Design a protein around this nucleic acid. Structure first.
Length: 165
DNA sequence: CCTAAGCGGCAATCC
DNA sequence: GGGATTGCCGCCTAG
């Protein structure tokens, strides 16, 4: 679902096999929270309100990963930085950490990009359907409730995993 | 001047 | 009370 998305590139399988074969100096297990108006479920939160008073609904694939201080404060974590992310299923796009405490982990220049990777993967495995809330059952049915954020010898390129079963 | 969403931070919550 | 945390809302500014 990410092939035709602007800013997203395809990384060859053999290029992936080598990258993930390296051991990371920094590794993080970012929890997939089940918050209902934030995180994976930003779609169910309030829309964006204009000065006229209209509230425009969020796109279905708009998501964020809010990372706690317990992981943010850890050494090596990209605080308020932009970086390249290479996914375990062979996709590359830009991400940027932002907000207070640099808690907000999002795809860069298109919030939907990270959403299409996460929700798309959930949908593809049949654990989620359009306009449905992501719950503990969704993650249990998928087979994983954490994202793996790993460092690479290049300080501006990270590895990101969300394998199921 | 509008338009729009990227992402910066308001504010609800806890102790 | 208000420092700490972050779930959630919408300001801000590029184009």
């Amino acid at each position: 679902h990410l092939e035709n998305c602007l800013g997203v590139q395809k990384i060859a399988p053999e290029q992936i096999r080598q990258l993930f074969a390296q051991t990371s100096e920094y590794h993080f297990s970012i929890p997939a929270k089940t918050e209902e108006k934030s995180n994976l479920n930003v779609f169910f939160g309030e829309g964006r309100r204009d000065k006229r008073g209209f509230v425009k609904p969020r796109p279905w694939y708009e998501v964020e990963l809010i990372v706690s201080k317990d992981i943010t404060s850890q050494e090596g974590y990209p605080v308020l930085k932009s970086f390249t992310v290479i996914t375990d299923d062979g996709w590359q796009f830009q991400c940027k950490t932002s907000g207070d405490y640099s808690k907000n982990f999002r795809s860069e220049n298109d919030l939907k990009t990270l959403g299409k990777w996460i929700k798309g993967r959930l949908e593809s495995h049949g654990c989620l359907q359009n306009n449905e809330k992501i719950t503990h059952e969704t993650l249990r049915e998928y087979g994983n409730d954490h994202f793996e954020l790993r460092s690479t010898d290049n300080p501006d390129v990270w590895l990101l995993s969300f394998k199921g079963k």
